[PDB]
Amino acid sequence: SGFRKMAFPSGKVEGCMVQVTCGTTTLNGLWLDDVVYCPRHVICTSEDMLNPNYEDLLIRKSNHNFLVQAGNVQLRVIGHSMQNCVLKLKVDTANPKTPKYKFVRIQPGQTFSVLACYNGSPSGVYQCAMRPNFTIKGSFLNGSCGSVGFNIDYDCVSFCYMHHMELPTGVHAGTDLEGNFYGPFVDRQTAQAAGTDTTITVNVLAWLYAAVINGDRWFLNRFTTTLNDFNLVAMKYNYEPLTQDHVDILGPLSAQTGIAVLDMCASLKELLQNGMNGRTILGSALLEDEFTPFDVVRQCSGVTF
Amino acid sequence: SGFRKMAFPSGKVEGCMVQVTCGTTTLNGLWLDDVVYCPRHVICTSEDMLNPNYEDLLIRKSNHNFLVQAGNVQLRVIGHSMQNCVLKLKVDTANPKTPKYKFVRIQPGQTFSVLACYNGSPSGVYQCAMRPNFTIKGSFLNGSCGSVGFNIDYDCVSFCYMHHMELPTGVHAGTDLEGNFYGPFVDRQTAQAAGTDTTITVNVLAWLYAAVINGDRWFLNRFTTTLNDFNLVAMKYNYEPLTQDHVDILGPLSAQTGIAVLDMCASLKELLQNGMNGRTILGSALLEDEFTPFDVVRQCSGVTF
Numbered sequence A, B: 001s002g003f004r005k006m007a008f009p010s011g012k013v014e015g016c017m018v019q020v021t022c023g024t025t026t027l028n029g030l031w032l033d034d035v036v037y038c039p040r041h042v043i044c045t046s047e048d049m050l051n052p053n054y055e056d057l058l059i060r061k062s063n064h065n066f067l068v069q070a071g072n073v074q075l076r077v078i079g080h081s082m083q084n085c086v087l088k089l090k091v092d093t094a095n096p097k098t099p100k101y102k103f104v105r106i107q108p109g110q111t112f113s114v115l116a117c118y119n120g121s122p123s124g125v126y127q128c129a130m131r132p133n134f135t136i137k138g139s140f141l142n143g144s145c146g147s148v149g150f151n152i153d154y155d156c157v158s159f160c161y162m163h164h165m166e167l168p169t170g171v172h173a174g175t176d177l178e179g180n181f182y183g184p185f186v187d188r189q190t191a192q193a194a195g196t197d198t199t200i201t202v203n204v205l206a207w208l209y210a211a212v213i214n215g216d217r218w219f220l221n222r223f224t225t226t227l228n229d230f231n232l233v234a235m236k237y238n239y240e241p242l243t244q245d246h247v248d249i250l251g252p253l254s255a256q257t258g259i260a261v262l263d264m265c266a267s268l269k270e271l272l273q274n275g276m277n278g279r280t281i282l283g284s285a286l287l288e289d290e291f292t293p294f295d296v297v298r299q300c301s302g303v304t305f
């Protein structure tokens, strides 16, 4: 037992990190097969950032303007192309340490592991949720751009995130591995608000199931609720609406604990309307919303990779 | 910016995990060079656990009673010995993936990364603190014994923890890699209380510095305090005494923020005596004590490995 914010083992990703330099900008790239992926703003000067024409700027670059290093090994760039906001550098060597992988685009409320890197070297690993406003609450310093987020599925690393920038609120934004930003953002140095952040209701419910599985049960009650009446209360507290698809994904946890999803919703309703009265759940005084139902199942059932 | 519970990259450890079977008990081992390390209670029957004589039980075992597997590779055990509560199996193959390493014994309040494994396969990675009562608040299911905790120092994995057992309170206990338990525990199935848990004061102070570094500053005040007067308040709230050595280790953070250690102590004093009044620090409603001063510096300065 116990319940922790747990990341995927990062070994299969550490072997893909390289350092990409263009001009005086050094950041991280992802070296899969014979392509290195990195944020396209590696080609910009700080003056270019206010309003860059990336098409024009990349045309003025040549292959030898890109210095890619895998440790000490100097990779020779033989081609460069732009896919949305990511740059694809073709190199003369396939990365042997290339795992089985796919590129996936996660949905708001889904979680992933971030391998934070600097100068192509891993610094640490942590777990993040894609917020409903398509930011992430990461931990990133200058030099971290090109760090990636990922899940492991059996043997196959699904890459879902590449880090590009930080908002004035301290939260972070980036793309999927085809180069499309999550959220409304563009890679230009202008004011760009993220939406209202909301609480990921299905994840709070998942974590309440995790608490029950670990013997923390004081919040269970005799009350029940319809899904609609739950959402009327939840939306007042800036919680995301709970859908029937969400109810379905909570099914395994409902089955394992014997507590119907709408019964647990009635627990959450009372916690929202009455607070926790100075009590804690799984050691927290606030409700936690960065565990998905699948996260709870994997951690409470011991899935390996 | 941002601040996360961050673990070390786990790649150099994933290559050391193997599966050890003896009788009907399967758990994890650590394969370094030509020695596999695992908990000695792998040799016990469930009936042996109430009061085992490990010396007698191991004498009745032979090398071929130990089935060690590195994936599909069958390792041949050529020797077995017991060091305190860990079993050392000599094998006929040195592990190539063996990193530079040492065995270290951490002190209460220090943190480490746990690579949770089942059947010799990594399941996930998370960060833990050694509690002042020498338990850890981990996440471990049946089959996780032999999972290890570690820090990375430049290039050298310092192994500090091997998982052995879970207490009735849901917290966990284990040994260092020379086989000595942390805390008062013995590997026998009897009632064994952990002491009072206390709050790791130097770590709370570290995390308050991390909050200031991230622009969360509402808790700063004009008050100051002597170290002794701080400890008089802190001990009333079951906080560990803050020592002059602790003050020294907070020095870098004091220097970088310009806030004297005793000035920050006066902030902590008021938070303890007045609560947070429904405010949060770094998104938490409770004070966090599982980041060391070095953790905060590494994460806020971007140290890599």
Ligand SMILES: *[C@](O)(C(=O)NC1CC1)[C@H](CCC)NC(=O)[C@@H]1[C@H]2CCC[C@H]2CN1C(=O)[C@@H](NC(=O)[C@@H](NC(=O)c1cnccn1)C1CCCCC1)C(C)(C)C
Pocket (backbone or CB within 6 Å): A025, A026, A027, A039, A041, A049, A141, A142, A143, A144, A145, A146, A164, A165, A166, A167, A168, A173, A185, A186, A187, A188, A189, A190, A191, A192
């Ligand atoms: C990353 O490229 C890297 O690691 N580079 C290595 C060191 C050489 C770098 C890391 C940030 C710490 N990212 C960036 O430099 C990005 C790029 C891509 C988008 C614009 C530039 C600057 N940038 C940033 O992350 C900045 N953030 C912003 O500029 C925000 N701007 C504003 O909020 C704003 C407000 N009023 C007026 C004008 N701008 C972002 C920009 C994009 C939309 C969301 C808001 C800094 C300040 C460096 C964090």
Ligand SMILES: *[C@](O)(C(=O)NC1CC1)[C@H](CCC)NC(=O)[C@@H]1[C@H]2CCC[C@H]2CN1C(=O)[C@@H](NC(=O)[C@@H](NC(=O)c1cnccn1)C1CCCCC1)C(C)(C)C
Pocket (backbone or CB within 6 Å): B025, B026, B027, B039, B041, B049, B141, B142, B143, B144, B145, B146, B164, B165, B166, B167, B168, B173, B185, B186, B187, B188, B189, B190, B191, B192
């Ligand atoms: C680990 O060996 C493993 O992963 N094995 C693989 C599946 C085959 C296994 C994992 C636990 C979930 N650990 C154990 O089996 C250890 C060993 C070593 C010490 C005794 C045995 C049993 N054990 C446990 O972790 C148990 N915990 C306890 O027995 C507590 N006992 C009591 O609290 C207690 C209370 N009243 C009377 C008698 N005992 C521990 C025992 C040691 C001191 C602290 C308290 C379980 C119940 C399996 C968690």
